[PDB]
Amino acid sequence: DVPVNLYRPNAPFIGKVISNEPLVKEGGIGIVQHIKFDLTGGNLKYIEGQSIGIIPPGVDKNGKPEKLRLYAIASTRHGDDVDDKTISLCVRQLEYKHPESGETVYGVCSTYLTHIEPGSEVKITGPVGKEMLLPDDPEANVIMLATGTGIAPMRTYLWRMFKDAERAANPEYQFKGFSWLVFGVPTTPNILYKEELEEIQQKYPDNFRLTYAISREQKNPQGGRMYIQDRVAEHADELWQLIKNEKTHTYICGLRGMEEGIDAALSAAAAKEGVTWSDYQKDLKKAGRWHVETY
Template identity: 30%
Template sequence: MSALPAFSAPPSLLSPAQSDLVETLTTSLDGAGLWWLSGYAAGLARAQALPTTRPMAVPAADAQPAPTLTIVYGSQTGNARRAAESLAQQVEAAGLGVRVLRADTYATRELKQERHLIVVISTQGDGDPPDDARGFVEFITGKRAPRLPELQFAVLGLGDSSYPQFCAVGRVLDERFAALGAKRWLPRGDADLDIETVATPWLANALTVARESLKPQAPLATVTPLRPLAAATSAYTRDNPFHAELLANQRITGRNRDGAWSDKDIRHIELSLEGSGLHYQAGDALGVWPHNPPQLVDAVLTTLALDGEQPVAHGGTDLPLREWLSSRRELTRLSRPFVVSHAARAKDAALDARLVPDNAAGLADLLAHHQLIDLLRAHPAPWSAEALVASLRPLVPRLYSIASSSKAVGDEAHLTVAHIEYRVETGTDDDGTDGLRWGAASSFLARAAEGERIRVFIEPNERFRLPTDGSRDVIMIGPGTGVAPFRGFLQERDTTGATGRNWLFFGNPHARTDFLYQSEWQDALRRGRLHRLDLAFSRDALRAITADDASAAPARKTYVQDRLREHGAEVFAWLEGGAHLYVCGDATRMAKDVHAALLALIAEHGGRSAEDAAEYLNALQAQGRYARDVY
């Protein structure tokens, strides 16, 4: 981290002890924490009648307090946070009062007093709010939300149009604020994965209306802040990624007794961050900028009869079409806007039927289970190179939970990557891919050779952190590649000498082929660094029931949520003793099933009703003791 100027405060303002406390607090906070603290401190200052004899800049006696803009964000992958903080910096630079808060740190009791509010919030999966905004959204949409006739508000929604419930959370909040009597400052913005297309002009408009509405009643003297915002720890960011050397690319799923490989191709990836200045904490993610599979790029060019060497100018950039399709445009994920554009060209009744309002299921199936090449082949239509580049979504980076602790591995970052590659039936005509389909980033990483350079950046995950108190117990639930951050957690706890107990729940189809990092977990058990390991190998449980046993119970797969229920009394005892609980992995099914299992065991072993169990789990989340990294 860049060195900060030495902290000092006039003795007339702070005692030495107070100065020490302020320095300790501010040097330990991240950007979001500092923004929150500045707003909180400003609120306290406004609430107190500070003596004018203190050497501080204050408004003239007859002036009204300057209005303040509150920006609340809910973010799962960091995009909403970046947009909110960018707006806050612009508003502050314009000399206006502003505070920016993560949704789970916003005191909802303050809502009645708000006059200017902007919410920047993402939508996850099937219309769900990000984890850090669940309580905020529940409050706003619930019965306890107050009437807000004096509030001016605006909502910027972020989402992914490949999902049917695109930007649904932003839409719900926008409509609910209006129903509570608040006045829209700006029309709602709905930003797709190419966020800047919508967010940049929307944020510019937000700054304009803020300047008009938040003009101070009287000029204020300039106040030098206690310390400037911390400079970035590295010159390398999402938009200026570091070219990291690939140190290792090892398949960590194995072969069965018959010599056949596991159905899963899971890779352990090691990347060098040496010389980058990049730093991460256990629980953070690594962003990877991928290239699309060359075989897929060739197939798209062939299907559309386009020349890959044709130069295409778009958005101020001039590149050959092949380069646009390889590194700048999404080919493995369909979006509704592109399907609509293609349907207008194809004039195909079957495709048009997918887009009618009452066929949401048909469109959802198309977006979830088909790629661009499938659409182009099933519903042929002419495209020019320029129109294709303009209509396809920009290729965006993929985030992977970091599977290491920098305290243990130094200037490296390790990943656990599931290589997505599968075959589909393509009919009698060859689509140029041999029927193979891929995940963009996982395929890119899987085919990369040691020594190659991968464009990466660090994406902080502030809500997925180990407890600062090393004596606290931790429960980690991570089936499949969801185990990745817990490898980093265990390395971190081992290196720092944490004394709390560590309990890991892990699951996958087969123990013989899919027991990821088996030797590491067994070594940690032997050394007493991992105190409990509970496993759920779902397909092995099926094999345990013999076909000739007519009295056997129906075959049933066993998952991590089943292990949670089996050990419910002990899990609840750990939680009652102050343990922190973490879940990582699939958001669609696993995370929901695990959440339901937690509610059930809390109700059963805590003697609570279903409603009280939900309150218990919500309280853990509010305390930072129940954190999820789901995708």
């Protein structure tokens, strides 16, 4: 029974910030924060792959109240402390330029979130989303293709699969399939949750594969900067082979633009066996096994 819209924007849950910690290490590009919120005093429950809304304070340029922005939940259903009391987000401060009006422009909700102080009250809505749900089958294979904050739902899956405290809390979900995260960020300091992702791979080398595309540190075979599409091309046959399994699910998450390259790579692999990827993919989407969340 998937929880949905336990809180709506006309009457959101007022949560309290517990912590706000930086995920981008020194020498990284930009600001991405792990923000944990207290859910006690309300009934907001959620599952892995879902999102919540945050309503920032203030009015827009037209004097109208700011509307919610959606953020993929970055914590498992139990929260980071496995106490069912919290929810966490993985929020990048949006910044861009020109041509324009002024200089650097800062996104309203993301700046609010990335600078929020512990103790602050936050308007939270949701949860929402049924497109990024993890299968209950402990034998499923799970391919995770993420860039930047697209890591968020992947963390919910991986923590539930691989954290000691999660395994203890979830007797009915003892993961024994194969998971493969291909994660594209510009620098090593930008590898969000690097230490924990690497701890998982070290502990579960037969159940979790971790592949990085680090654009400022790595070049693809054509001499271009390395992106997630390049790693998918590099492993296209293996990925296609995994995708052919009736129990394999694929998840794609992050800023828009990565899908075309991923499709081209898998299209070339499937074509070798006389399969039209775009058609096979349509069928996968219909079966709930091809999960995309780009923004």
